[PDB]
Amino acid sequence: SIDVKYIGVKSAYVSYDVQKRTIYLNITNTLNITNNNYYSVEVENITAQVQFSKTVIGKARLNNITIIGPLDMKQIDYTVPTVIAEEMSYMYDFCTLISIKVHNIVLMMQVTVTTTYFGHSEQISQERYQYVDCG
Amino acid sequence: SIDVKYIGVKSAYVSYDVQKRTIYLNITNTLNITNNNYYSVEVENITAQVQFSKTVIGKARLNNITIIGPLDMKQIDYTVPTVIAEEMSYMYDFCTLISIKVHNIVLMMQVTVTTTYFGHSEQISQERYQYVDCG
Amino acid sequence: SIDVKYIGVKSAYVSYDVQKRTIYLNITNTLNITNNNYYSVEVENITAQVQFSKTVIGKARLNNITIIGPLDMKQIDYTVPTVIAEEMSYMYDFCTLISIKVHNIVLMMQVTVTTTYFGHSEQISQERYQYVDCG
């Protein structure tokens, strides 16, 4: 990437910005902008690009062959008892959460067993997280 | 990518912005913008691009062959008892959540066993997360 | 991509913006914009692009062959008892949620066993998440 911007409130290339309780009297503004941009990005100049996978087996014996790729999740056990007993009680549960395996952004890319690749790979991830707001 | 922008409220290339309780008297504004843009992106100049998968087997014996790709989830057990007993009680559950395996954004890309690829791969992910807001 | 924008409220290329309780008197505005744009994107200049899958088997014996692609979910067990007993109680459940495996955006792309690919791959994902708002 080239220009990545994080701004919380206001992005302004030109801002004549005035707030309340201002007296804005006798202003003469003269403004000139000359903006010229060159973007020349991701230029590839190749005479030849060659890729292959060659596998050759001859007079061979294969047994007990196991191949397992990434992200192998096995024998997962979640046990979350919640045993709440009461005896003439006043329960006041205002802002309470019970979260198990909560995901916001999951990006899986180029997850294989055998891979051949030429080129550009780019991830851009922007957000404002706010899990709990309780008043 | 080239220009990625995060702004919370306001994006303005030109902003003559005025808030309340302003007296806006005697303003003479003269403004000129000359904006010129070149975008030249993802240019590929290739005389030849070659890709293959060749597999050759000769007079070979194969047995007990197992191939498993990525993302193999096996033997998953979620157990969430919620045993709530009462005895003349006043329960006040205002803003309570029970969330199990909640997903917002999941992007699966190029998830295989054998892959051959030439080119550009780009992910852009923008959001404003806010899980719980309770007053 | 080239220009990706996140703005919470207002995008304005030119904004003469006025809020309440303004007295807007004696304003002379003269404004000129000259905007010129070149977009030249995803240009491919190839004399030859070759792709194949060749598989050759000769006088070979194959047995116990198993191939499993990605995203293999097996033996999944969710058990969520909710046993709520009462004895002369006052239950006040205002804003409560029970969510199991809730998904918002799931994009599956290029998920195979064997793949050959040339080109451009792009994902763009924009949103405003807000799960729970209770007053």
Ligand SMILES: *[C@@H]1O[C@H](CO)[C@@H](O)[C@H](O)[C@H]1NC(C)=O
């Ligand atoms: C604002 O400008 C005008 C013109 O030049 C002038 O007559 C006036 O007196 C100015 N305002 C004040 C408060 O002096």
Ligand SMILES: *[C@@H]1O[C@H](CO)[C@@H](O)[C@H](O)[C@H]1NC(C)=O
């Ligand atoms: C911009 O505008 C002002 C206004 O008078 C002028 O003096 C200046 O020469 C201009 N510049 C260009 C580059 O156009």
Ligand SMILES: *[C@@H]1O[C@H](CO)[C@@H](O)[C@H](O)[C@H]1NC(C)=O
């Ligand atoms: C890309 O490469 C080719 C061959 O090498 C060349 O003729 C061409 O001018 C190049 N392009 C740029 C923008 O440099």
Ligand SMILES: *[C@@H]1O[C@H](CO)[C@@H](O)[C@H](O)[C@H]1NC(C)=O
């Ligand atoms: C490996 O081979 C033996 C016999 O040759 C077999 O009993 C065993 O199950 C094989 N392994 C797996 C993981 O299957």
Ligand SMILES: *[C@@H]1O[C@H](CO)[C@@H](O)[C@H](O)[C@H]1NC(C)=O
């Ligand atoms: C605003 O401008 C006019 C014209 O120049 C001028 O007569 C007037 O007095 C100005 N306003 C004030 C409050 O001076």
Ligand SMILES: *[C@@H]1O[C@H](CO)[C@@H](O)[C@H](O)[C@H]1NC(C)=O
């Ligand atoms: C922009 O406009 C102003 C207004 O008078 C002028 O003076 C200036 O020469 C202009 N510039 C261009 C580049 O057009």
Ligand SMILES: *[C@@H]1O[C@H](CO)[C@@H](O)[C@H](O)[C@H]1NC(C)=O
């Ligand atoms: C792309 O490459 C070809 C051959 O190398 C060349 O003739 C052409 O001018 C190139 N294009 C650019 C924009 O550089």
Ligand SMILES: *[C@@H]1O[C@H](CO)[C@@H](O)[C@H](O)[C@H]1NC(C)=O
């Ligand atoms: C491997 O081979 C043996 C016998 O040769 C068989 O009993 C076993 O089940 C095989 N493995 C699997 C995982 O099936």
Ligand SMILES: *[C@@H]1O[C@H](CO)[C@@H](O)[C@H](O)[C@H]1NC(C)=O
């Ligand atoms: C607004 O402009 C006119 C014309 O120039 C002028 O006569 C008037 O006095 C101005 N307003 C004020 C409040 O001065």
Ligand SMILES: *[C@@H]1O[C@H](CO)[C@@H](O)[C@H](O)[C@H]1NC(C)=O
């Ligand atoms: C824009 O308009 C203003 C208004 O007078 C003028 O002075 C300027 O020369 C113009 N510029 C162009 C590039 O047309």
Ligand SMILES: *[C@@H]1O[C@H](CO)[C@@H](O)[C@H](O)[C@H]1NC(C)=O
């Ligand atoms: C694309 O490539 C061809 C052959 O290399 C060339 O003749 C043509 O001018 C190129 N196009 C651009 C826009 O560069």
Ligand SMILES: *[C@@H]1O[C@H](CO)[C@@H](O)[C@H](O)[C@H]1NC(C)=O
């Ligand atoms: C593998 O082969 C054996 C006998 O050769 C068979 O009993 C077994 O079921 C095979 N494996 C699978 C997974 O079927």
